[PDB]
């Protein structure tokens, strides 16, 4: 099994990044990731070239295993997070990680391992790994855990997949700017699909989560709704207004994070609507 060591990484998803490993689709790959915190740094291991993947494809990354350490780091301070125009100083706290819980002074927060940065090469230019758009990026979506498949739209040959910013746990919003940041080993399985998509999609056992990242949260919310209704309209071949009504009844619109240059909204679309 191929291992991508943490020392091979990027600080931008760039159209022109060079690969540091090549895989056939169907292969498993271990990514060793450094924590996000270490201020010219938020590193994503990779990028990885996947044979035969073309622009307009969908790269599929199944998250098999996230191996976490026993210590984590959270940080906040002036100018950071949702109330950064209201907090002083710069603060950091070490956090103990047990098998089932992150410990926070007296508190046992249920563990919830997740990959916070995941993306591929964009169409043009470069986006820092600290932000996100259609190619993926710093989406801090907690749904990206073990036993899901992240679908990503492809813009460059080979996809050029990179990944990092693993958290031991997090709440939706990530309001202080950070979660429990940790270095990790993430075991993934990479496959391809020839269908084109606009924005990333996380497939869990019972839901599709469409994930939209734009500079203002209101716009991201409008976009993910537009994308959710169409999704349903195409898969069920029903009139748009019916899909719109169906999404009002069964789709849960939400928030991934409110703190990166691009804000991440999501929409849970249950598989029961198709099955």
Least distance from C-beta 209 to Zn ion, angstroms? 17
Strand 101-104: give its sheet, edge to edge: 71-77, 90-97, 101-104, 107-110
Say if residue 27 carries a ligand binding annotation: no
Is 140 one of the binding residues for Zn ion (CB under 5 A)? yes
Question: Which residues does residue 192 pair with via DSSP β-bridges, in sequence order?
Answer: 59
Termini Cα distance of the chain: 36
Question: Which of Cl ion, a copy of itself, Zn ion, none is residue 235 near (CB under 5 to 8 Å by kind)?
Answer: none
Question: Which of a copy of itself, Zn ion, Cl ion, none is residue 58 near (CB under 5 to 8 Å by kind)?
Answer: none
Say if residue 191 carries a ligand binding annotation: no
* 175: number of Cβ within 10 Å: 16
Is 57 one of the binding residues for Zn ion (CB under 5 A)? no
Stretch that binds a copy of itself, among 7-15, 51-59, 146-154, 174-182 (CB under 8 A): 174-182
Is 170 one of the binding residues for a copy of itself (CB under 8 A)? yes
**Three-state SS annotation for 98-142:** CCCEEEECCEEEECCCEEEEEECCCCCCEEECCCEECCEEECCCC
Give φ, ψ of 153 to 5 degrees.
-70, 145
Identify which of residues 37 and 109 has a Cβ nearer to a copy of itself in the complex.
Answer: 109
Least distance from C-beta 140 to a copy of itself, angstroms? 10
| Nearest-angstrom CA–CA distance, 136 and 201 | 10
Q: Tell which positions 157-216 bind Zn ion, by CB under 5 A.
A: 165, 179, 181
| Nearest-angstrom CA–CA distance, 106 and 164 | 29
Q: Tell which positions 81-100 bind Zn ion, by CB under 5 A.
A: none
Task: Establish how many alpha carbons lie within 13 A of residue 254's alpha carbon, considering only the half-sphere containing its beta carbon.
Answer: 20
Question: Which residues does residue 63 pair with via DSSP β-bridges, in sequence order?
Answer: 188
| Nearest-angstrom CA–CA distance, 65 and 187 | 5
Beta-strand pair 2-4/28-33: parallel
Q: Which of 20, 74, 132, 150 binds a copy of itself (CB under 8 A)?
A: 74
Q: Which of 129, 138, 213, 256 binds Zn ion (CB under 5 A)?
A: 138
Give the interface with Cl ion as residue ranges (CB under 5 A).
Answer: 197-199, 227
Q: Looking up tokens 């399985």, which residue turns up?
A: 189
Least distance from C-beta 123 to a copy of itself, angstroms? 25
Q: Which of 172, 189, 191, 203 binds a copy of itself (CB under 8 A)?
A: 172
Least distance from C-beta 229 to Cl ion, angstroms? 11
Binding-site residues for Zn(2+): 138, 140, 165, 167, 174, 181
Binding-site residues: 138, 140, 165, 167, 174, 181
Q: Which residues form the interface with Zn ion (CB under 5 A)?
A: 36, 116, 138, 140, 165, 179, 181
């Amino acid at each position: 099994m191929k291992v991508v060591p943490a020392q091979r990484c990027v600080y931008s998803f760039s159209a022109n990044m060079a690969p540091v490993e090549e895989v056939y689709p169907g292969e498993q790959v271990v990514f060793e990731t450094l924590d996000a915190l270490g201020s010219k740094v938020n590193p994503a291991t990779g990028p990885v070239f996947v044979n035969g993947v073309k622009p307009g494809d969908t790269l599929k990354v199944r998250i098999k295993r996230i191996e976490l350490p026993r210590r984590g780091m959270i940080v906040t301070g002036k100018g950071f997070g949702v109330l950064g125009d209201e907090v002083e100083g710069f603060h950091t706290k070490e956090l103990e990680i047990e098998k089932w819980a992150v410990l926070f002074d007296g508190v046992r927060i249920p563990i919830h391992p997740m990959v916070g940065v995941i993306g591929v090469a964009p169409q043009e230019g470069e986006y820092p790994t600290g932000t996100a758009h259609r190619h993926g990026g710093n989406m801090d979506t907690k749904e990206i855990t073990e036993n899901v498949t992240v679908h990503l739209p492809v813009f460059q040959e080979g996809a050029l997949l990179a990944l990092g910013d693993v958290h031991a746990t997090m709440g939706d919003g990530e309001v202080c700017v950070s979660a429990c940041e940790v270095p990790a080993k993430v075991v993934v399985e990479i496959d391809v699909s020839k269908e084109e998509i606009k924005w990333p999609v996380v497939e869990t056992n019972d839901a599709y989560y469409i994930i939209v990242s734009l500079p203002d949260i209101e716009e991201a919310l409008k976009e993910v709704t537009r994308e959710t209704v169409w999704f349903i309209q195409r898969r069920k071949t029903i009139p748009f207004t019916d899909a719109y009504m169906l999404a009002s009844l069964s789709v849960d619109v939400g928030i991934s994070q409110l703190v990166n240059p691009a804000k991440t909204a999501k929409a849970r679309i249950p598989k029961y609507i198709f099955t």
